[PDB]
Amino acid sequence: ENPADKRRRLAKQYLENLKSEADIIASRLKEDVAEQQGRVFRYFGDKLLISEAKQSFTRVGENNLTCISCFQPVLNKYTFEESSNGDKNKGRLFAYTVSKDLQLTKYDITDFSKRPKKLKYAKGGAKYIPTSKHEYENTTEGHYDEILTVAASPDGKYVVTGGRDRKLIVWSTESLSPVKVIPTKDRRGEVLSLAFRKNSDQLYASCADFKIRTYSINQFSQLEILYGHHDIVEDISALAMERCVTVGARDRTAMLWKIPDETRLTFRGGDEPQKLLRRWMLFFCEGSIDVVSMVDDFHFITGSDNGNICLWSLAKKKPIFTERIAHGILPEPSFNDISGETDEELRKRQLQGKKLLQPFWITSLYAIPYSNVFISGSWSGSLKVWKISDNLRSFELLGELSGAKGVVTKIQVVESGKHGKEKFRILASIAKEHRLGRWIANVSGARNGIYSAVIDQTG
Amino acid sequence: AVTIRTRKVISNPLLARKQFVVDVLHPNRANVSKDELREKLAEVYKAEKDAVSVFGFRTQFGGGK
């Protein structure tokens, strides 16, 4: 019973399972290894049924729910063992959420029919303020400032959080107990985004000090700092390989980092309404790029503050396709309050027609790995699902989900069921204020809660 | 933590070997001994330590690499 024979047995059992499920077997085996080849291999936009999605909203006590991260076990083909940390956690789905109230909470989302169920939580406060005042000594167990982000390790053994307290605290998934605190060690190094390399313990951290920090959670140590962004790196995404992508906010530049090659590729939008209007014969100039999600190892999408969703390719520096004002234009300000004049017509002139109108921001944008569908978010009050073309040159609006009401700080997707028939659950964090700050005016009907939508595959 | 990175790898069957450039990232550390680096390269390449050679290592100005 040598170890090799054990691999044989698992594979032989594995092959029997595929035979029981079902030419077909050969294709599935290729699909199992489609991931290493960094190309889209999940064409399921058409078979989605958005109209029949079961939508639900669950209120949460915490103020301004800032981010959500979902962990999904995946069977490892190489060893035929599930990613679950322990036998008790076999086939259990967990979702971790953070808020501005210095509280980390975990939920169980295994039952798609049922709402998220809270399991454990940890809350920080003034008790954790460091007395030393030195950056290297910011090693307190809990948070003392707003927590902005959270990420779950692919092994299911740790969950890591960060925020304006310029610390990177990694917690045990089971008990939410802190095990290591890693200071960023810069005065303005506020953590803004975390992305785990898929099926790896590598972590990429974007900090407000214009740098990206890489960590090895298993070793609980920093590895490298990346330089080249000109403004705060608000978002970060990562896939199986080490090619993470970023966006520079007011820099209006999206950068891809070939960590092995120690080289970086620069992408810039470069759209001007004057040319756009002429070619047509409301167009808003891009102000900042806030979100990014990598659809494919050779493609990625970005969302700007002018409501533009742009598709990118590694070959081309310019966008290959753009979708302008994706979430529409903000409501025009009321005439009765724009000015204090008694006569209404005076107040209307202050509106200046439609010049003051501005578009919704793309606060959230998530693409399922190696798929042809991605989801965008804003405070318009609905989540829009888009399908990318087969040639990966354009995308269209697949559908919409209107259940969510408020700022969609972050979006996540989880899948369950057999390979052929999969049920997708969309989990999106909803907050009354934007995650980074309180600029946004209060939206009518907005509530702090976790939005849940469950979508099925039929054809 | 210390990161070891291999680039410009060229297979040379004439000499029956692998030639490459070593980049060592060693934050908060002076530098890494040739012996330890030989251990790690041997483990990475699944070859005997005796078959791994390293030389010409220069620390970049300002340290850390």
Binding site: - | A1, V2, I4, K18
Partner: peptide
């Protein structure tokens, strides 16, 4: 006649 068509990758380890 056409010329012959053109034809080891970096590997990483972290320790300590």
């Amino acid at each position: 006649p056409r010329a012959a068509k053109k034809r080891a990758k970096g590997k990483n380890l972290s320790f300590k």
